[PDB]
Write a protein that holds these residues in place. Structure first.
Motif, PDB file in Angstrom:
ATOM      1  N   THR A  95       9.254   4.614   4.979  1.00 47.05           N
ATOM      2  CA  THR A  95       9.111   6.184   4.839  1.00 47.05           C
ATOM      3  C   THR A  95       9.831   6.416   3.979  1.00 47.05           C
ATOM      4  N   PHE A 116       1.364   5.463  -0.078  1.00 48.87           N
ATOM      5  CA  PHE A 116       0.313   6.920   0.313  1.00 48.87           C
ATOM      6  C   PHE A 116       1.520   7.945  -0.305  1.00 48.87           C
ATOM      7  N   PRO A 117       0.732   8.687  -0.855  1.00 44.80           N
ATOM      8  CA  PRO A 117       1.611  10.146  -1.049  1.00 44.80           C
ATOM      9  C   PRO A 117       1.576  10.888   0.011  1.00 44.80           C
ATOM     10  N   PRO A 118       2.769  11.792   0.047  1.00 42.71           N
ATOM     11  CA  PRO A 118       2.539  12.988   1.024  1.00 42.71           C
ATOM     12  C   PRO A 118       1.259  13.641   1.475  1.00 42.71           C
ATOM     13  N   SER A 119       0.913  13.836   2.804  1.00 42.05           N
ATOM     14  CA  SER A 119      -0.537  15.065   2.964  1.00 42.05           C
ATOM     15  C   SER A 119      -0.245  16.012   3.139  1.00 42.05           C
ATOM     16  N   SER A 134       0.864  -0.887   0.012  1.00 38.41           N
ATOM     17  CA  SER A 134      -0.444   0.004  -0.199  1.00 38.41           C
ATOM     18  C   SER A 134       0.752   1.276  -0.280  1.00 38.41           C
ATOM     19  N   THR A 193      11.714  10.494   3.015  1.00 41.91           N
ATOM     20  CA  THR A 193      11.285  11.627   3.546  1.00 41.91           C
ATOM     21  C   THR A 193      11.818  12.820   2.454  1.00 41.91           C
ATOM     22  N   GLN A 239       1.726  18.501   5.652  1.00 41.82           N
ATOM     23  CA  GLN A 239       2.939  18.326   5.803  1.00 41.82           C
ATOM     24  C   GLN A 239       3.903  18.637   4.870  1.00 41.82           C
ATOM     25  N   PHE A 245       3.196   0.730   3.172  1.00 44.31           N
ATOM     26  CA  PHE A 245       2.879   0.032   4.324  1.00 44.31           C
ATOM     27  C   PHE A 245       2.920  -1.209   4.063  1.00 44.31           C
ATOM     28  N   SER A 300       6.993  13.257   2.975  1.00 44.39           N
ATOM     29  CA  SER A 300       6.500  12.157   3.433  1.00 44.39           C
ATOM     30  C   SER A 300       6.246  10.603   2.600  1.00 44.39           C
ATOM     31  N   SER A 345       7.025  -0.961   7.193  1.00 42.81           N
ATOM     32  CA  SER A 345       6.248   0.247   6.863  1.00 42.81           C
ATOM     33  C   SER A 345       7.716   1.055   6.292  1.00 42.81           C
ATOM     34  N   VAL A 366       4.708   7.080   1.850  1.00 42.36           N
ATOM     35  CA  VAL A 366       4.336   6.636   2.526  1.00 42.36           C
ATOM     36  C   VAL A 366       4.247   4.605   2.466  1.00 42.36           C
TER      37      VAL A 366
END
Ligand SMILES: [Ca+2]
Lengths: 214, 211
Positions: B178, B118-121, B116, B180, B124, B135, B131, B176, B133
């Motif tokens: 990450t 996830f693009p950075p929020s 899974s 950055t 942030q 999983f 960052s 996970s 992420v």
């Protein structure tokens, strides 16, 4: 039954001092020798110090002698560990432990532990970034740049239990970072709301970030 | 000082299999050898005292043997409630000393990971950082490989990896990843991709998004 309860663990700057203490219960304290044992993830268990029943004889290992002072209060049933000239290598979880002998021996009973961290880092609440996706969906939550451990991460105040993954912290820039994932049915989102709550007792901070579709 | 040496370091056995742990002291310590069990987050528990004296309340498939310098701890039929870390302790000469421990993993069926990414929020980003992420859940064995490559390239600097202990339910691992990298170096590179290498698949299991 026997009960040992440590307390005192905190953040302390290198070369600092601190005092740990143990509340002994459920057994005639004045009859056994007591001791401290610490545990680091990189070097396992390690006898830190011992003291006899009447407290007249004390024994410490060499890598501690001088700096550490063990002692007790048989009147109050409490054990103490005075530490000074604290070092980064002293960072560990300290256990209050009982010897089955009047002096020293093996260890039959162990407390729940208290953590000691030795660093220059300052207490910092963490930043919490919600992690959403662009049969069942998987959401996340990033807890970055806090210090020191721990951080408590729950989802929906604990309502969600199944399929929750909280991964250990990691020192990266001299601040910890951890993340957590959760899996929910594709139907329960984004219909039902989802939130990761992150509590950081060290800074009396506690945030609640709701996950929403980007 | 007496040097207690434990072995094996780790050991992935499967239900019912026999578990043997040995400990050797650099000096004669008589029958002053003790063993401990410690599950994740919890203090060590007492299991065998001096003279190979099994502990009260302790199951009968746990036995200790030895006198002098060579000692052996034994779990006969390993039940999935034995999966912990164990430690030996010599006790006839201060300073007391433990073995470096033996961790136990449950040898269980293979399991492919559920990746899974996830693009950075935005929140942030607003703070001046980014960052990404990734999983990877409920797989086995832990021995997995995660590769990241920025815009069809190959980056691997500024990445964090965390691994969860072996699940107490399905005995599988999860991790996970990450990545950055300042918002700048972020939004202006295009395809952020997460690649894995687990012995469940023959080809690289990928996962990625585009900005
Ligand atoms: Ca002894």
């Amino acid at each position: 039954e026997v009960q040992l309860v440590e307390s005192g663990g905190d953040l302390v700057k290198p070369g600092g001092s601190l005092k740990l203490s143990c509340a002994a219960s459920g057994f005639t304290f004045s009859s056994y020798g007591m001791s401290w044992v610490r545990q680091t993830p990189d070097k396992g268990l390690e006898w830190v110090a011992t003291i006899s029943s009447g407290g007249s004889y004390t024994y410490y290992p060499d890598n501690v002698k001088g700096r550490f002072t063990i002692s007790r209060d048989n009147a109050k049933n409490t054990l103490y560990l005075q530490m000074s000239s604290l070092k980064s290598e002293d960072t560990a979880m300290y256990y209050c432990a009982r010897h089955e002998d009047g002096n020293w021996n093996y260890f039959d009973y162990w407390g729940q532990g208290t953590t000691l961290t030795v660093s220059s880092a300052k207490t910092t609440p963490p930043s919490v970034y919600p992690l959403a996706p662009g049969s069942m969906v998987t959401l996340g939550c990033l807890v970055k740049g806090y210090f020191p451990e721990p951080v408590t991460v729950t989802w929906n105040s604990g309502s969600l239990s199944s399929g929750v993954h909280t991964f250990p912290a990691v020192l990266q820039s001299d601040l910890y970072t951890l993340s957590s994932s959760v899996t929910v049915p594709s139907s329960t989102w984004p219909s039902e709301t989802v939130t990761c709550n992150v509590a950081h007792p060290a800074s009396s901070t506690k945030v609640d970030k709701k996950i929403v579709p980007r | 000082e007496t040097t207690v040496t434990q072995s094996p370091a780790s050991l992935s056995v499967a239900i019912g299999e026999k578990v043997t742990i040995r400990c050797i002291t650099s000096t004669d310590i008589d029958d002053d050898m003790n063993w401990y069990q410690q599950k994740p987050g919890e203090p060590p528990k007492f299991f065998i005292s001096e003279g190979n004296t099994l502990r009260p309340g302790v199951p009968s498939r746990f036995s200790s043997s030895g006198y002098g310098t060579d000692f052996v701890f034994t779990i006969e039929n390993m039940l999935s409630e034995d999966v912990a870390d164990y430690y030996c302790l010599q006790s006839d000469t201060l300073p007391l000393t433990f073995g470096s421990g033996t961790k136990l993993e449950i040898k269980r069926a293979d399991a492919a990971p559920t990746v899974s990414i996830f693009p950075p929020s935005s929140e942030q980003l607003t703070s001046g950082g980014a960052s990404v992420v990734c999983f990877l859940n409920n797989f086995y064995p832990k021995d997995i490989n995660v590769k990241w490559k920025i815009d069809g390239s190959e980056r691997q600097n500024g990445v964090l990896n965390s691994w969860t202990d072996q699940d107490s339910k399905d005995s599988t691992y999860s991790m996970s990843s990450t990545l950055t990298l300042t918002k700048d170096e972020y939004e202006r590179h295009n395809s952020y991709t997460c690649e894995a290498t687990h012995k469940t698949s023959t080809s690289p299991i990928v996962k990625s998004f585009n900005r």
